[PDB]
Amino acid sequence: SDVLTVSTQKPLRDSVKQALKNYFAQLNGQDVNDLYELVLAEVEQPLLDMVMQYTRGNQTRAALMMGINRGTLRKKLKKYGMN
Amino acid sequence: DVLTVSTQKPLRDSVKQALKNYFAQLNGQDVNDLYELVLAEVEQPLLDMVMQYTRGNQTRAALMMGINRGTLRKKLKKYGMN
Amino acid sequence: MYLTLQEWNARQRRPRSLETVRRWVRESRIFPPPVKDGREYLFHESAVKVDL
DNA sequence: AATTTTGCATAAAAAACAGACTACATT
DNA sequence: AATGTAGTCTGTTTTTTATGCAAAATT
């Protein structure tokens, strides 16, 4: 049924929900102002590492598989110190 | 380190395992929308959690998320969160 | 009626790199010649590659 | 009653986009 | 020879943003 799942198997969305549930528990009155970016960077980097590993360093195929502009991929790879 | 999931391994490790499993099931299938696919799986729980924390207050949810309120109501409308 | 350079190519018997398909437009190898509307090319759904 | 949130409109900055083109690689 | 890719650019469109404001809702 679900295409992105983790090892019994469960959806990746269920693991994100649990990761944030823990974060809000270990948030003893802290003001948070960058939660989107924090989650995005934690999910973008392993996606970039896995796709680049899959395409064997081929940027053009990674971008084509991801459905993002090649110039956009190159920027994200630079952001995470990967190129 | 800050975003982790119980045995406690980090979240990036759960994304890596989901994609390893995904590439394995690609039986001749031609991938074209992987960024959005991952993003939509990660965006729905984030929006669910942050709104649950702010008790449905979008003003506070946008501030916590570091995004603009307009951008938030757009993402909410996309995942049918109305 | 009209496709993007990417759509047109995806529909080809042997799709190529978008870099290759652009070189073709730049070299006048696509007939009828795609028009550039802003940032993109617009291929008529019937457009073919020609041997020069 | 007072204060905050929301829904929606702008305009501009920021991001993502298609393409151009060269040097070198792979087919 | 023709095609494919990294890297460096240009110009265009789309998304995000700050801001103003009135109605609605919460305090």
Residue numbers in the entry:
A (entry chain A): 8 to 14, 23 to 98
B (entry chain B): 9 to 15, 24 to 98
C (entry chain E): 1 to 52
Passage from the reporting paper:
During the site-specific DNA recombination reaction that excises phage λ from the chromosome, the bacterial DNA architectural protein Fis recruits multiple λ-encoded Xis proteins to the attR recombination site. Fis is a bacterial nucleoid protein that functions in transcription, replication, and recombination reactions. Xis is a winged-helix DNA binding protein, which is expressed at high levels shortly after prophage induction, but by itself, exhibits low binding specificity. To explore the structural basis for Fis recruitment of Xis to the X2 site within the λ prophage attR recombination site, X-ray crystal structures of three different Fis–Xis–DNA complexes were determined.
The ‘FX2’ structure contains a Fis dimer, an Xis1–55 monomer (hereafter referred to as Xis), and a 27 bp DNA duplex representing the native sequence except for an A/T base pair at each end. The most important base-specific contact by Fis in high affinity Fis binding sites is mediated by the guanidinium group of Arg85 to a guanine, and in the FX2 structure, both the N7 and O6 atoms of G7b are within 3 Å. Thus, each base of the position 7 C/G pair is directly contacted by either Fis or Xis (Glu19-C7:N4, 2.7 Å). The Arg23 side chain is present in both conformations in the FX2 complex with the dominant rotamer contacting the DNA backbone, as is the case for the X2 site within the X2–X1.5–X1 microfilament structure. The FX2 structure reveals for the first time a layer of interconnected solvent molecules spanning most of the major groove interface with Fis. Our three crystal structures of Fis and Xis bound to the F-X2 DNA segment reveal little (70 Å2 in the FX2 structure) or no (both FX1-2 structures) shared surface between the Xis and Fis proteins. The closest approach in the FX2 structure is between the polar end of the Xis Gln6 side chain from helix A and the Fis Leu79 side chain methyl, which emanates from its positioning helix C. The 27 bp DNA in the FX2 structure exhibits an overall curvature of 61° (calculated by CURVES), which is within the lower range of bending angles measured in X-ray structures of Fis bound to different DNA sequences. The DNA backbone over the outer 4 bp of FX2 that is proximal to the Xis basic surface (Xis residues Arg14, Arg16, Arg23, Arg29 and Lys49) is then pulled up to 6 Å closer to Xis relative to the Fis-F1 complex, enabling hydrogen bonding by Xis Ser17, Thr20 and Trp24 to proximal phosphates. The result is a snug fit between the peptide backbone and the minor groove surface (surface complementarity score between the Xis wing motif and DNA in the FX2 structure is 0.826).
